[model samples]
Target: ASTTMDVQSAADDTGLPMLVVRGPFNVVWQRLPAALEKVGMKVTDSTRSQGNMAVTYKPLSDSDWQELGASDPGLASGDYKLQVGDLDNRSSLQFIDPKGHTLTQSQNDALVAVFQAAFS
Candidate 1:
């Protein structure tokens, strides 16, 4: 028998977008890099501590830069913070810029789509 992982968007009081993932932290952790890669993002740096992972990524191709359009001009890429909580069974993932600002709704939605597709 197999089990299904529970993954969904979550509400954040910090006004930042987040994804709530219910499963083993390690499973989600390991899959994140590959997911980013699949979506044309290169994992440049990452740090794992306690139950969280902070990742810095860059666009892998020119097409990726093109997709950023004018919303993120002068920005080569961005950073994402993934917090695994609920006894490591749940995770809250947020995308933020280097300046510590949350990404726009459309940008967050796009990245979440990539994560959903990869995690599925």
Candidate 2:
């Protein structure tokens, strides 16, 4: 879940584009294949906060998935929670789970715990 380039602030006083990454969502599955399968998972729940974010997930192997961020290059980039007329609602996105691979909240907690143990 990283950006292809560093985000930059807008040149104008509007203070936009400060948080807009090269794309919308921070795709977490594209580059990580083995890790995803270790948990018996395929797609990740969207962490996108707005409609401007788009994330695509593709499972590549038993432990891996591919995540791609789709975004417009020419649009004035900005990370705004509430922009007028913009379909930026974060709740509109869906978290995909493979059939028979549903994870309970507790399981999710455990997953995070393992992630912390390994990375932290």
Candidate 3:
């Protein structure tokens, strides 16, 4: 049941990890929620037209982190926004702060790697 939509890391123009998916806007949107759920992030307050969703994240268990092959990103217990930016054939996912900047960290690239895996 897998589609060809691929997810990977990308340039960080905004000082945030860009979890980029090589698919159309709507293409990525369909599976985005389930991907977040797979990583234990709670979804709320979605804006489908603009592709923005609010997610609340707590620290992951060590086992869960191990599953993702990533440690915590210091994003624990935070009210963060997952912003999906549309491109013709790609979409970018970013963790934004309450104030609209990139969210926290221990290792951002590894975090992006986790998401890249989650999306596939």
Candidate 4:
């Protein structure tokens, strides 16, 4: 099934990269450069499903999982963050990657810290 997130007029005007970050392992990323264009937000990099970045985790057990971090390096005008979670379970973390943030810690900590610090 395909899910679509509509951008509000204000969000469309923000001129920030419209990032649809999803998954602990699976997601589809699409860019609406048209909206950015309307606001004069030059899209230096706009690629659909550019890449599938994931955080390895055991779905059923408390096993070791490799953590991963990702962000739009070019998103300097608006806001950007590391969004990760379990889609099937509806539990996830959404945060803005601070100046020097790392994702190599505990999954919960990594997620919460980013969110907390981004807003603090």
> What lDDT does the true structure give each of the candidates?
0.57, 0.26, 0.73, 0.28
In the range 1-120, model 4's lDDT, one tens digit per residue, is 434232111111333222222332232222323322322233343222433122221121112112212122222343323333334522233324345343332432333322222222
lDDT of 1: 0.57
Clashing pairs for predicted structure model 4, backbone only: none
Per-residue lDDT of 1-120 in model 3, one digit per residue for the tens?
664356666656745566777887887777888877766788878999878899887667988878876666556577888888887798887777798877444345556756765665
What TM-score would every model get versus the actual structure? 0.61, 0.24, 0.79, 0.22
Tens digit of per-residue lDDT, candidate 1, span 1-120: 333355566657866666677666676667767765655456665666565556665554656534533122232355655555543677667655556676565665555445555554
Q: Which candidate number maximizes lDDT? A: 3
In angstroms, give how far residue 3 of model 3 lies from its true place.
4.9
How well does model 2 score by local distance difference test? 0.26
Error of 2 at 62 (Å): 19
TM-score of 3: 0.79
Q: Compare the candidates by TM-score and give the number of the best one.
A: 3
In candidate 2, stretches whose alpha carbon ends up further than 4 angstroms from where it belongs are 1-26, 38-102, 117-120
Q: Which residue pairs show collisions in model 1?
A: none
Better of 2 and 4 by lDDT: 4
Off by over 4 Å in 4: 1-5, 8-31, 51-120
Candidate 3: clashing pairs of residues:
none
Q: Could you give the candidate ranking by TM-score, starting with the highest?
A: 3, 1, 2, 4
Q: Which stretches of candidate 3 lie over 4 Å from their true place?
A: 1-5, 12-17, 104-107
